[PDB]
């Protein structure tokens, strides 16, 4: 009883889709399933690191509240579309991608110039539309790795050399996960009946693996609890 | 400093006593120099 | 005398005039905070430099991005570069 | 008496925040009291927060 606690283990990971995923923790003692599920859900939904678009720069655009000749979408709409772009960066922690397109057609994420470290999870994510044969778009996109939701207003506080006219700030939502759910069910181990199994369903943007996210959440929880371990 | 307020109509002599001068022209500002 | 809208304003630093163009009007797309100078104007002083600063400034606590500049010029007055 | 006029237009993006007044179409009105984090919102069985 004192040392009869069974340590949960990552049993099976089910990847039903590119974004949707399911993970299983088993075995779990009575009552521990709900606690672990709630803690993991609260940690994952708030403190998951991820990469997001921070700054944009178009050659012919001076400010967001403007229009470009030959594009159907407004500059503000283009920034909003870029805000939802999903990109994974390995080591640089800050990347500057370049996009160049011409001719009539939908300019999507697949037209971004190839970089070895970065990877576009959704190449079909539409960015804008060119509705003229002579219309050409050239764009520079800054991608930064962070945590949580950091609006551009807070980032304005930085004052090194101001900003050149034409650099558009984009609100960054670094959180890769968007939906987390959990449920506890009966678990069968040997001949023990009072055991629980936790199933966690995660819907994300595809830029993080469920196992890595679970490991990061567990590490964060352990680091936080280390303060209570030594109360002093 | 003061304890009460007295109000009465003003004699011409007292009105002249109040004034530091006599206004004789309607001009206000030169509008060239202020 | 008349009031001239020029980029040359007395008793202002070079940093304040950085946003202003050669015509004395703020650039389109520049982000101006409270107290920033938008249009540089000088008013003739008294008969007694001889120019006082009456330039338009952003009201305190008001921010934003300049998106449009419209210049109306009375006939007989030479138009500037922005117009 | 006036020679020239110059008009400058400034655009500001106002985001929502506590104290802003919202309402409905049925006479219900109020002000935002707190911008609560996502994990603190109530959620259904599927985990979708309100």
PDB file of N, CA and C in Angstrom, chain D:
ATOM      1  N   UNK D   1      -8.450  83.618 -46.364  1.00  0.00           N
ATOM      2  CA  UNK D   1      -7.409  83.768 -45.376  1.00  0.00           C
ATOM      3  C   UNK D   1      -6.528  82.551 -45.172  1.00  0.00           C
ATOM      4  N   UNK D   2      -6.947  81.376 -45.639  1.00  0.00           N
ATOM      5  CA  UNK D   2      -6.175  80.148 -45.486  1.00  0.00           C
ATOM      6  C   UNK D   2      -5.613  79.759 -46.846  1.00  0.00           C
ATOM      7  N   UNK D   3      -4.327  79.414 -46.875  1.00  0.00           N
ATOM      8  CA  UNK D   3      -3.646  79.089 -48.121  1.00  0.00           C
ATOM      9  C   UNK D   3      -3.624  77.589 -48.395  1.00  0.00           C
ATOM     10  N   UNK D   4      -3.232  76.786 -47.409  1.00  0.00           N
ATOM     11  CA  UNK D   4      -3.063  75.355 -47.623  1.00  0.00           C
ATOM     12  C   UNK D   4      -3.685  74.578 -46.474  1.00  0.00           C
ATOM     13  N   UNK D   5      -4.091  73.341 -46.759  1.00  0.00           N
ATOM     14  CA  UNK D   5      -4.603  72.423 -45.747  1.00  0.00           C
ATOM     15  C   UNK D   5      -3.944  71.068 -45.958  1.00  0.00           C
ATOM     16  N   UNK D   6      -3.492  70.444 -44.871  1.00  0.00           N
ATOM     17  CA  UNK D   6      -2.903  69.111 -44.920  1.00  0.00           C
ATOM     18  C   UNK D   6      -3.619  68.243 -43.897  1.00  0.00           C
ATOM     19  N   UNK D   7      -4.167  67.118 -44.348  1.00  0.00           N
ATOM     20  CA  UNK D   7      -4.884  66.187 -43.489  1.00  0.00           C
ATOM     21  C   UNK D   7      -4.139  64.861 -43.464  1.00  0.00           C
ATOM     22  N   UNK D   8      -3.916  64.335 -42.262  1.00  0.00           N
ATOM     23  CA  UNK D   8      -3.203  63.082 -42.057  1.00  0.00           C
ATOM     24  C   UNK D   8      -4.138  62.115 -41.347  1.00  0.00           C
ATOM     25  N   UNK D   9      -4.218  60.888 -41.853  1.00  0.00           N
ATOM     26  CA  UNK D   9      -5.088  59.864 -41.294  1.00  0.00           C
ATOM     27  C   UNK D   9      -4.248  58.813 -40.584  1.00  0.00           C
ATOM     28  N   UNK D  10      -4.605  58.520 -39.336  1.00  0.00           N
ATOM     29  CA  UNK D  10      -3.899  57.552 -38.508  1.00  0.00           C
ATOM     30  C   UNK D  10      -4.830  56.388 -38.209  1.00  0.00           C
ATOM     31  N   UNK D  11      -4.344  55.170 -38.425  1.00  0.00           N
ATOM     32  CA  UNK D  11      -5.123  53.959 -38.206  1.00  0.00           C
ATOM     33  C   UNK D  11      -4.599  53.229 -36.978  1.00  0.00           C
ATOM     34  N   UNK D  12      -5.504  52.885 -36.066  1.00  0.00           N
ATOM     35  CA  UNK D  12      -5.171  52.187 -34.832  1.00  0.00           C
ATOM     36  C   UNK D  12      -5.998  50.912 -34.765  1.00  0.00           C
ATOM     37  N   UNK D  13      -5.343  49.800 -34.445  1.00  0.00           N
ATOM     38  CA  UNK D  13      -6.011  48.516 -34.271  1.00  0.00           C
ATOM     39  C   UNK D  13      -6.305  48.328 -32.788  1.00  0.00           C
ATOM     40  N   UNK D  14      -7.574  48.462 -32.417  1.00  0.00           N
ATOM     41  CA  UNK D  14      -8.003  48.301 -31.035  1.00  0.00           C
ATOM     42  C   UNK D  14      -8.392  46.848 -30.797  1.00  0.00           C
ATOM     43  N   UNK D  15      -7.695  46.197 -29.874  1.00  0.00           N
ATOM     44  CA  UNK D  15      -8.005  44.831 -29.488  1.00  0.00           C
ATOM     45  C   UNK D  15      -8.909  44.825 -28.262  1.00  0.00           C
ATOM     46  N   UNK D  16      -9.580  43.693 -28.050  1.00  0.00           N
ATOM     47  CA  UNK D  16     -10.483  43.574 -26.916  1.00  0.00           C
ATOM     48  C   UNK D  16      -9.677  43.468 -25.627  1.00  0.00           C
ATOM     49  N   UNK D  17     -10.290  43.889 -24.528  1.00  0.00           N
ATOM     50  CA  UNK D  17      -9.631  43.938 -23.230  1.00  0.00           C
ATOM     51  C   UNK D  17     -10.702  44.143 -22.163  1.00  0.00           C
ATOM     52  N   UNK D  18     -10.388  43.852 -20.899  1.00  0.00           N
ATOM     53  CA  UNK D  18     -11.366  44.095 -19.832  1.00  0.00           C
ATOM     54  C   UNK D  18     -11.775  45.558 -19.781  1.00  0.00           C
ATOM     55  N   UNK D  19     -13.064  45.785 -19.537  1.00  0.00           N
ATOM     56  CA  UNK D  19     -13.642  47.106 -19.548  1.00  0.00           C
ATOM     57  C   UNK D  19     -14.357  47.466 -20.834  1.00  0.00           C
ATOM     58  N   UNK D  20     -14.079  46.758 -21.925  1.00  0.00           N
ATOM     59  CA  UNK D  20     -14.785  47.001 -23.175  1.00  0.00           C
ATOM     60  C   UNK D  20     -16.227  46.528 -23.064  1.00  0.00           C
ATOM     61  N   UNK D  21     -17.136  47.273 -23.686  1.00  0.00           N
ATOM     62  CA  UNK D  21     -18.563  46.996 -23.586  1.00  0.00           C
ATOM     63  C   UNK D  21     -19.008  46.147 -24.770  1.00  0.00           C
ATOM     64  N   UNK D  22     -19.551  44.970 -24.479  1.00  0.00           N
ATOM     65  CA  UNK D  22     -20.158  44.106 -25.477  1.00  0.00           C
ATOM     66  C   UNK D  22     -21.637  43.940 -25.157  1.00  0.00           C
ATOM     67  N   UNK D  23     -22.372  43.376 -26.106  1.00  0.00           N
ATOM     68  CA  UNK D  23     -23.817  43.277 -25.964  1.00  0.00           C
ATOM     69  C   UNK D  23     -24.336  42.179 -26.881  1.00  0.00           C
ATOM     70  N   UNK D  24     -25.649  41.961 -26.825  1.00  0.00           N
ATOM     71  CA  UNK D  24     -26.323  41.055 -27.729  1.00  0.00           C
ATOM     72  C   UNK D  24     -27.470  41.758 -28.433  1.00  0.00           C
ATOM     73  N   UNK D  25     -28.206  40.976 -29.215  1.00  0.00           N
ATOM     74  CA  UNK D  25     -29.345  41.496 -29.958  1.00  0.00           C
ATOM     75  C   UNK D  25     -30.636  41.484 -29.154  1.00  0.00           C
ATOM     76  N   UNK D  26     -30.615  40.962 -27.928  1.00  0.00           N
ATOM     77  CA  UNK D  26     -31.809  40.851 -27.100  1.00  0.00           C
ATOM     78  C   UNK D  26     -31.739  41.746 -25.867  1.00  0.00           C
ATOM     79  N   UNK D  27     -31.017  42.858 -25.960  1.00  0.00           N
ATOM     80  CA  UNK D  27     -30.940  43.808 -24.872  1.00  0.00           C
ATOM     81  C   UNK D  27     -29.967  43.458 -23.770  1.00  0.00           C
ATOM     82  N   UNK D  28     -29.249  42.345 -23.882  1.00  0.00           N
ATOM     83  CA  UNK D  28     -28.268  41.952 -22.879  1.00  0.00           C
ATOM     84  C   UNK D  28     -26.946  42.644 -23.183  1.00  0.00           C
ATOM     85  N   UNK D  29     -26.420  43.374 -22.204  1.00  0.00           N
ATOM     86  CA  UNK D  29     -25.185  44.123 -22.368  1.00  0.00           C
ATOM     87  C   UNK D  29     -24.306  43.911 -21.146  1.00  0.00           C
ATOM     88  N   UNK D  30     -23.015  44.164 -21.320  1.00  0.00           N
ATOM     89  CA  UNK D  30     -22.085  44.023 -20.215  1.00  0.00           C
ATOM     90  C   UNK D  30     -20.704  44.480 -20.625  1.00  0.00           C
ATOM     91  N   UNK D  31     -19.767  44.331 -19.694  1.00  0.00           N
ATOM     92  CA  UNK D  31     -18.372  44.683 -19.913  1.00  0.00           C
ATOM     93  C   UNK D  31     -17.512  43.477 -19.573  1.00  0.00           C
ATOM     94  N   UNK D  32     -16.438  43.281 -20.341  1.00  0.00           N
ATOM     95  CA  UNK D  32     -15.534  42.172 -20.075  1.00  0.00           C
ATOM     96  C   UNK D  32     -14.860  42.389 -18.731  1.00  0.00           C
ATOM     97  N   UNK D  33     -14.940  41.380 -17.866  1.00  0.00           N
ATOM     98  CA  UNK D  33     -14.370  41.474 -16.530  1.00  0.00           C
ATOM     99  C   UNK D  33     -13.011  40.806 -16.407  1.00  0.00           C
ATOM    100  N   UNK D  34     -12.728  39.797 -17.226  1.00  0.00           N
ATOM    101  CA  UNK D  34     -11.460  39.088 -17.140  1.00  0.00           C
ATOM    102  C   UNK D  34     -11.210  38.354 -18.447  1.00  0.00           C
ATOM    103  N   UNK D  35      -9.964  38.385 -18.905  1.00  0.00           N
ATOM    104  CA  UNK D  35      -9.532  37.610 -20.064  1.00  0.00           C
ATOM    105  C   UNK D  35      -8.846  36.372 -19.497  1.00  0.00           C
ATOM    106  N   UNK D  36      -9.632  35.332 -19.279  1.00  0.00           N
ATOM    107  CA  UNK D  36      -9.176  34.113 -18.640  1.00  0.00           C
ATOM    108  C   UNK D  36      -8.375  33.267 -19.630  1.00  0.00           C
ATOM    109  N   UNK D  37      -7.358  32.545 -19.160  1.00  0.00           N
ATOM    110  CA  UNK D  37      -6.639  31.626 -20.049  1.00  0.00           C
ATOM    111  C   UNK D  37      -7.544  30.516 -20.562  1.00  0.00           C
ATOM    112  N   UNK D  38      -7.100  29.890 -21.654  1.00  0.00           N
ATOM    113  CA  UNK D  38      -7.913  28.883 -22.330  1.00  0.00           C
ATOM    114  C   UNK D  38      -8.161  27.688 -21.417  1.00  0.00           C
ATOM    115  N   UNK D  39      -7.126  27.236 -20.707  1.00  0.00           N
ATOM    116  CA  UNK D  39      -7.255  26.049 -19.870  1.00  0.00           C
ATOM    117  C   UNK D  39      -8.226  26.245 -18.713  1.00  0.00           C
ATOM    118  N   UNK D  40      -8.516  27.489 -18.332  1.00  0.00           N
ATOM    119  CA  UNK D  40      -9.447  27.747 -17.242  1.00  0.00           C
ATOM    120  C   UNK D  40     -10.907  27.737 -17.681  1.00  0.00           C
ATOM    121  N   UNK D  41     -11.180  27.811 -18.980  1.00  0.00           N
ATOM    122  CA  UNK D  41     -12.557  27.766 -19.455  1.00  0.00           C
ATOM    123  C   UNK D  41     -13.167  26.385 -19.236  1.00  0.00           C
ATOM    124  N   UNK D  42     -14.467  26.315 -18.951  1.00  0.00           N
ATOM    125  CA  UNK D  42     -15.146  25.018 -18.924  1.00  0.00           C
ATOM    126  C   UNK D  42     -15.115  24.365 -20.297  1.00  0.00           C
ATOM    127  N   UNK D  43     -15.025  23.039 -20.297  1.00  0.00           N
ATOM    128  CA  UNK D  43     -14.949  22.268 -21.526  1.00  0.00           C
ATOM    129  C   UNK D  43     -15.897  21.082 -21.450  1.00  0.00           C
ATOM    130  N   UNK D  44     -16.349  20.635 -22.616  1.00  0.00           N
ATOM    131  CA  UNK D  44     -17.267  19.513 -22.712  1.00  0.00           C
ATOM    132  C   UNK D  44     -16.479  18.205 -22.740  1.00  0.00           C
ATOM    133  N   UNK D  45     -17.162  17.104 -23.061  1.00  0.00           N
ATOM    134  CA  UNK D  45     -16.492  15.810 -23.133  1.00  0.00           C
ATOM    135  C   UNK D  45     -15.432  15.798 -24.227  1.00  0.00           C
ATOM    136  N   UNK D  46     -15.714  16.443 -25.360  1.00  0.00           N
ATOM    137  CA  UNK D  46     -14.746  16.519 -26.447  1.00  0.00           C
ATOM    138  C   UNK D  46     -13.568  17.428 -26.128  1.00  0.00           C
ATOM    139  N   UNK D  47     -13.631  18.185 -25.037  1.00  0.00           N
ATOM    140  CA  UNK D  47     -12.545  19.059 -24.653  1.00  0.00           C
ATOM    141  C   UNK D  47     -12.561  20.435 -25.276  1.00  0.00           C
ATOM    142  N   UNK D  48     -13.613  20.792 -26.002  1.00  0.00           N
ATOM    143  CA  UNK D  48     -13.688  22.112 -26.613  1.00  0.00           C
ATOM    144  C   UNK D  48     -14.092  23.142 -25.565  1.00  0.00           C
ATOM    145  N   UNK D  49     -13.263  24.144 -25.287  1.00  0.00           N
ATOM    146  CA  UNK D  49     -13.639  25.159 -24.301  1.00  0.00           C
ATOM    147  C   UNK D  49     -14.709  26.092 -24.842  1.00  0.00           C
ATOM    148  N   UNK D  50     -15.453  26.687 -23.918  1.00  0.00           N
ATOM    149  CA  UNK D  50     -16.437  27.700 -24.277  1.00  0.00           C
ATOM    150  C   UNK D  50     -15.738  29.043 -24.425  1.00  0.00           C
TER     151      UNK D  50
END
